[PDB]
Amino acid sequence: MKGDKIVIQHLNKILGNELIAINQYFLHARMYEDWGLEKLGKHEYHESIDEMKHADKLIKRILFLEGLPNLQELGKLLIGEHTKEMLECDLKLEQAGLPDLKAAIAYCESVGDYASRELLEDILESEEDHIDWLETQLDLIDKIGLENYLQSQMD
Amino acid sequence: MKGDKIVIQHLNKILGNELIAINQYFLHARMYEDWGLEKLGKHEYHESIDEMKHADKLIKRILFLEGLPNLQELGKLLIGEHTKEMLECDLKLEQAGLPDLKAAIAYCESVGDYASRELLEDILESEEDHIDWLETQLDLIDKIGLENYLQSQMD
Amino acid sequence: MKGDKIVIQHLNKILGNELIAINQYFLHARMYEDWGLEKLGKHEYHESIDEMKHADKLIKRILFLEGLPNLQELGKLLIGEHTKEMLECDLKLEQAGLPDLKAAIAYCESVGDYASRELLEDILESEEDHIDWLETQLDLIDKIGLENYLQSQMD
Amino acid sequence: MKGDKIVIQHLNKILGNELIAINQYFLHARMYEDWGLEKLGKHEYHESIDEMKHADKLIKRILFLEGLPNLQELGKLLIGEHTKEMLECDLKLEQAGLPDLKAAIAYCESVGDYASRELLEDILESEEDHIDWLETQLDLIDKIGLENYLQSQMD
Amino acid sequence: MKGDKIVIQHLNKILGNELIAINQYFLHARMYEDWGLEKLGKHEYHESIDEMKHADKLIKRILFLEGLPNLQELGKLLIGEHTKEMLECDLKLEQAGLPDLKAAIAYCESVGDYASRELLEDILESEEDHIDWLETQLDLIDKIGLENYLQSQMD
Amino acid sequence: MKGDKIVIQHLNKILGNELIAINQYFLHARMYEDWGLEKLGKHEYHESIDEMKHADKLIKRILFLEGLPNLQELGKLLIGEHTKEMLECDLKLEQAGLPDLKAAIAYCESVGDYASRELLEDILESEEDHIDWLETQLDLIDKIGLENYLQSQMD
Amino acid sequence: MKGDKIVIQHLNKILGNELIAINQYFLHARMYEDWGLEKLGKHEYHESIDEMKHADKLIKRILFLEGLPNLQELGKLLIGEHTKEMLECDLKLEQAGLPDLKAAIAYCESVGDYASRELLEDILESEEDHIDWLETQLDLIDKIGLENYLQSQMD
Ligand code: HEM
Ligand code: HEM
Ligand code: HEM
Ligand SMILES: [Ba+2]
Ligand SMILES: [Ba+2]
Ligand SMILES: [Fe+2]
Ligand SMILES: [Fe+2]
Ligand SMILES: [Fe+2]
Ligand SMILES: [Fe+2]
Ligand SMILES: [Fe+2]
Ligand SMILES: [Fe+2]
Ligand SMILES: [Fe+2]
Ligand SMILES: [Fe+2]
Ligand SMILES: [Fe+2]
Ligand SMILES: [Fe+2]
Ligand SMILES: [Fe+2]
Ligand SMILES: [Fe+2]
Ligand SMILES: [Fe+2]
Ligand SMILES: [Fe+2]
Ligand SMILES: [Mg+2]
Ligand SMILES: [Mg+2]
Ligand SMILES: [Mg+2]
Ligand SMILES: [Mg+2]
Ligand SMILES: [Mg+2]
Ligand SMILES: [Mg+2]
Ligand SMILES: [Mg+2]
Ligand SMILES: [Mg+2]
């Protein structure tokens, strides 16, 4: 079914943001794994597998709405050379992306593409959870110390 | 443990080839799914998960050899439009990659990084498998007819 | 137990044909499988295994009758190039051996070697079995057409 | 996938050797069985099935590399008259082919067919395995005597 | 089976390094146990068992090649007095053995002893895992501090 | 807890003897195995493991008594060339270590180190069972003949 | 059965020491528990129970030897006020009773009361494991710090 062009452009933009997350979180996940921070590694890993599920959902919707997914563009990954920075970089990434989600939800309501809106609402919820988890880690580092925080991420 | 700089470069080159296959195969997978070719989609989908595992393997090896993974470059993507073309694009891509796998296996051999060579031999063996399956599909199309072939990919 | 010289001669002769069937059917089975025709592959494979059990039986009986098995000579194999032909070559081999069995069974009767006859008797039943399936495949090709037939042999 | 011509020639040579093993070990196994040496017949029988597995693997690789199997030619066949000689002939056959596998591995390596090398790599480790058991049986005969060795092979 | 003379030497060179590893890790393991560092002790132990298995594989190989294993010469152990030093001695030990392994592997290639090579590749692959773990432990000590690292090493 | 200087000395003396048994018995075990004497190989193997467990106990006792385990010094191994000689070598080794054990037990008694004495008593009993087993095998050889004894040690 | 007057005396002496351990360890155990150091409280508790079982054995041996168990006299308990002091108090207590046990074992030996000696040996071993545990905790405190040690003793 021919969907709304602008909706598809919005959907293709969010898709591109998830691609960034996918790659970034997977790299950080292995960087933790490689450092002995197994706990952190697993969480970063699962976050990665979720962005993959998110991208997948958008891909399917874009295809249904008869448009062509953009799996070609890859944005600026924000890596990070150590835990505190990697946490920040990930939070940063999750935030620069919230505005897009909300704008597109707003646009979907205006044109009456409610089904695409529901899809975006769900993705939005997951993003607010990951941000909650990130702010939490960062705060924890402040309360117990980096050495303590890292010690507790080993197993 | 710092590894050979040229080995790490070869590793990163191959990582890039794989990243492309991941994206390409996942899009082709969801496209077949969107068209009703359930069988074809499922297979393409699994090929996608494998390329992802191969990527994860190279990343982990690179990280151990103390180099930086490049999950930032994303080369061209041979998209399909229709089935026969998608099979051809996929095969063509697994083939443009072989020369690279073999160049690196030989290089690793000359520098005595046997563990890296083994990693590459497994990935190699797995690729000659995909090419095998792919060729078979193209030959089947010409033996039974595209219409019959598509009919067989539905359930 | 010393066996009738001519009987062992017949026994060694049929054993020869069986060794040809083995190799020929095994080659067609991998050819079918290489082409993605799994259905033909399995059946050919099994009939190959069957021929192997026939040969084993001939070898044991010959050895008991105190003669030397001839597993050295290998007759000309009839390797087909395409399904329709491969099916016909297998039928020809099966019918060029029927003469032989019947002649050998008749011989055992006239010389009192009833045990050997019972052994050939059962190989004979099994051989007309392969022929029945083979003829049926060729007729099936004529009714539904080669393309549909091959489509049926894929999974 | 068009494979290397010389590689295909090597594969066909290794195949002709195995086809001989298969037949030789099968006749010795049935001979042992016939003589009442169960334990010995059972082992030859498995080696027999093992050579069959190697040939199957060589065949599959050849068809994939788009070459033409060579079942048709059956090389010489060393048949022993008694246990001691049957053990030696079997040992001579393995050791006569070992060089063939080593030359093939070197060739595959030189032309970049690492998959074929690994495939042969495994058949080589298995052929050295058969040899060790053969050497041992001969050595066991010298330490305990022929009559004792045979009595131990009855069950 | 007569093995290459120089290959046997290489195998014994390596067997000699493993014997050293066996003794050093076992002692270190029981020292950690004796201090209440159960986690570290348990891990040192398994690495000690691994080296024992490697030694076993080497011995078996040497015997098959008809050489005489050398369990008489035992080189200089590197005993530590405290955790950090012990970690460093294991690391040093492991790093002094890699060049030997790689040299042996390259020689087996040149003489065509591929089975021995495959054996040495596996051991090599395992030695790198241990080295990775060791390095990681040392980095963990700096990131979180010795007091924390050791506390995490208690049962 | 600080131990007696002389006690620790005796313990190391006995540990030095047990390290010789470990290597000798393990090598003899793999030699029987290579020769096809599974029964015998299996028994040597366990006696080898047994000595490993003994050494482990000595190691622990020593660290607890605050002494330094000596794994560095390795005495001369008595390796055989044929079964009868290999049995006499193990036996001779066991007999040489018998007086050292009783001397240590005696000393431990004279200084009130009953726990160390207890440990030593249990090891002494184990060593005495091994000696019985070795003496028995040598008698069996005399009663039934080397040929028969060796035939019995196969499966 | 009438026992030796002096043996019964030694037994009561050791029973007198064990009754002190019982009370001290039980009190220390409940003090750790009240402070929230479950791990530590649990260990003290079992050592307390252990001493109770020891006293029980001494009681029985004594009645059998026809002597009167002395439960009336209770020596001075060494109660601590903080963990480090509590560990040093238990340790000091164990060290004070070590010479009494060896003295008794010695006497039992000199009069042929081997059964009493046997019992005393087993208790001596248990007391020696406790001493090892206490020495270990004190070393751990030195290596990781009181803060960390105490954090580890919570859950
Ligand atoms: C184009 C972007 C991608 C998409 C749409 C995608 C999608 C998926 C999906 C749908 C799954 C299965 C999830 C499940 O079973 O719940 C998956 C798994 C996985 N992906 Fe990706 N992925 C992408 C990129 C990547 C990349 C770049 C890597 C590696 C660097 C990667 C590594 C993995 C791994 C390791 C798994 C787990 C496989 C397993 O179950 O063993 N993916 N992905
Ligand atoms: C000299 C002629 C041969 C004889 C007498 C023979 C005999 C046998 C027998 C008795 C079995 C076991 C069947 C069962 O119990 O299911 C067997 C299995 C088999 N044979 Fe042969 N065979 C011969 C030649 C070959 C050849 C030329 C090939 C081709 C590579 C081959 C491939 C196989 C395979 C793949 C199996 C299956 C083994 C398994 O079940 O794991 N054979 N053969
Ligand atoms: C240097 C002194 C050694 C000590 C203290 C020692 C100690 C041990 C211990 C405690 C075990 C575990 C036993 C059990 O599970 O009950 C073991 C297993 C073993 N050891 Fe040793 N060992 C020593 C030397 C050796 C040597 C020189 C070899 C020869 C290659 C060897 C080969 C083995 C093998 C093959 C196992 C069995 C591993 C398994 O399959 O679990 N050990 N050793
Ligand atoms: Ba802490
Ligand atoms: Ba149809
Ligand atoms: Fe997302
Ligand atoms: Fe997210
Ligand atoms: Fe791949
Ligand atoms: Fe692939
Ligand atoms: Fe047949
Ligand atoms: Fe047939
Ligand atoms: Fe083979
Ligand atoms: Fe073989
Ligand atoms: Fe090792
Ligand atoms: Fe190692
Ligand atoms: Fe021992
Ligand atoms: Fe012993
Ligand atoms: Fe007690
Ligand atoms: Fe106690
Ligand atoms: Mg549609
Ligand atoms: Mg690292
Ligand atoms: Mg007979
Ligand atoms: Mg093909
Ligand atoms: Mg041998
Ligand atoms: Mg030092
Ligand atoms: Mg201590
Ligand atoms: Mg009474």
Swiss-Prot record, chains A, B, C, D, E, F, G:
Its EC number is 1.16.3.1. The keyword Cell membrane does not apply. Keywords: Heme, Ion transport, Iron, Iron storage, Iron transport, Metal-binding, Oxidoreductase, Transport. It is an enzyme of class 1 (oxidoreductase). GO terms for cellular component: cytosol. It catalyses: 4 Fe(2+) + O2 + 4 H(+) = 4 Fe(3+) + 2 H2O; Fe(2+)(in) = Fe(2+)(out). Disulfide bonds: none annotated. Heme b binds at M52. InterPro entries: Bacterioferritin, Ferritin-like, Ferritin-like_diiron, Ferritin-like_SF, Ferritin_DPS_dom. Fe cation 2 binds at E51, E94, E127, H130. It holds the Pfam family Ferritin. CDD domains: Bacterioferritin. GO terms for biological process: intracellular iron ion homeostasis; iron ion transport. Its cofactor is heme b. GO terms for molecular function: ferric iron binding; ferroxidase activity; heme binding. Fe cation 1 binds at E18, E51, H54, E127. Gene3D superfamilies: 1.20.1260.10. The keyword Iron-sulfur does not apply. Binds 1 heme b (iron(II)-protoporphyrin IX) group per dimer. Belongs to the bacterioferritin family. PANTHER family: BACTERIOFERRITIN (PTHR30295:SF0). NCBIfam families: bfr. Iron-storage protein, whose ferroxidase center binds Fe(2+), oxidizes it using dioxygen to Fe(3+), and participates in the subsequent Fe(3+) oxide mineral core formation within the central cavity of the BFR protein shell. This is Bacterioferritin. The gene is bfr.
